[PDB]
Amino acid sequence: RPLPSWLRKPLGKASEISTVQRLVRQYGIHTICEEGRCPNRGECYGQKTATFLLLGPTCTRACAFCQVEKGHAPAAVDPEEPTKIAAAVATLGLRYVVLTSVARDDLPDQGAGQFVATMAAIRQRCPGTEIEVLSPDFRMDRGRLSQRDCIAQIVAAQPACYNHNLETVRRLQGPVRRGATYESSLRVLATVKELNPDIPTKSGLMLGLGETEAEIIETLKDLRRVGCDRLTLGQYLPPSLSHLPVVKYWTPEEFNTLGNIARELGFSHVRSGPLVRSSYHAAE
Ligand code: SF4
Numbered sequence: 442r443p444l445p446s447w448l449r450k451p452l453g454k455a456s457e458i459s460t461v462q463r464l465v466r467q468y469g470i471h472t473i474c475e476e477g478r479c480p481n482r483g484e485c486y487g488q489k490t491a492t493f494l495l496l497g498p499t500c501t502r503a504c505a506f507c508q509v510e511k512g513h514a515p516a517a518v519d520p521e522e523p524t525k526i527a528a529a530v531a532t533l534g535l536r537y538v539v540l541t542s543v544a545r546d547d548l549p550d551q552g553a554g555q556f557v558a559t560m561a562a563i564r565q566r567c568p569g570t571e572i573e574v575l576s577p578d579f580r581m582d583r584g585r586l587s588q589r590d591c592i593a594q595i596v597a598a599q600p601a602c603y604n605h606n607l608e609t610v611r612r613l614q615g616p617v618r619r620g621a622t623y624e625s626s627l628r629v630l631a632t633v634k635e636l637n638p639d640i641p642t643k644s645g646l647m648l649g650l651g652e653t654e655a656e657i658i659e660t661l662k663d664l665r666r667v668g669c670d671r672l673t674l675g676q677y678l679p680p681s682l683s684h685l686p687v688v689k690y691w692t693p694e695e696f697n698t699l700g701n702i703a704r705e706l707g708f709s710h711v712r713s714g715p716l717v718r719s720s721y722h723a724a725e
């Protein structure tokens with residue numbers, strides 16, 4: 442499984458990004474871009490986009506693919522996080538913002554209010570900035586606000602796009618994800634369309650975890666059945682030796698081919714390639 446050529450070059454490239462790095466730390470908030478040293482930073486920062494991580498910076502779930510730092514207990518909730526993010530968005534002059542969060546099984550609203558508050562803070566401070574949500578599944582809802590109502594709170598704030606990743610095919614949901622299921626994640630996407638069919642929905646998979654093309658294609662059809670508009674396909678790269686190994690490096694050609702299959706199946710926006718991530722070119 443050594444690193445293929447098409448990946449060594451872009452994974453070793455560095456760009457001028459220091460102002461952004463400094464501001465994020467200074468304002469006391471966290472981005473996926475920085476928490477994972479994303480190889481797309483030069484391009485995204487250049488396009489005035491970033492992905493902020495709410496309710497962390499650690500997660501307790503420890504999904505075997507995920508780059509978020511593992512935490513011993515739920516991160517204390519910062520009531521000023523929404524305002525601080527909006528201030529960063531303003532000073533960075535971002536045009537397109539993706540909001541995501543860690544899973545918060547411990548909170549009565551599963552953290553859904555934090556999304557709503559952050560969206561409100563950004564709208565009141567930053568004119569023209571669009572906001573995409575990369576949502577948790579909100580599935581652990583016994584005695585909580587229901588999965589449906591968590592989604593509804595966010596849908597009510599009219600994101601530019603509602604993204605919820607399946608991450609992998611049905612067969613691999615067990616080993617790849619913790620606390621998630623295939624049907625629950627598809628239900629997130631369907632629920633958004635029930636609540637407001639005008640909100641674009643998006644999902645994504647990471648390839649290289651042992652899925653086959655046959656299984657990928659079935660998953661694409663499953664996504665179109667719940668009216669998923671947008672798709673990202675990217676290469677799984679283990680964040681550390683403790684994470685799942687890469688089974689396969691999918692070639693640029695294979696990503697192109699699958700990209701085109703997805704377009705034929707009616708996805709209206711598709712990004713497919715080795716360094717593609719959920720937020721990559723999200724602004725379109
Ligand atoms: S791909 Fe996503 S995570 Fe990476 S730099 Fe762009 S916005 Fe940040």
Ligand code: SF4
Pocket residue numbers: 500501502503504507508509542543544619
């Ligand atoms: S995928 Fe979500 S739940 Fe799993 S570790 Fe990452 S942040 Fe936590």
Ligand code: NA
Pocket residue numbers: 473492718719720721
């Ligand atoms: Na992302």
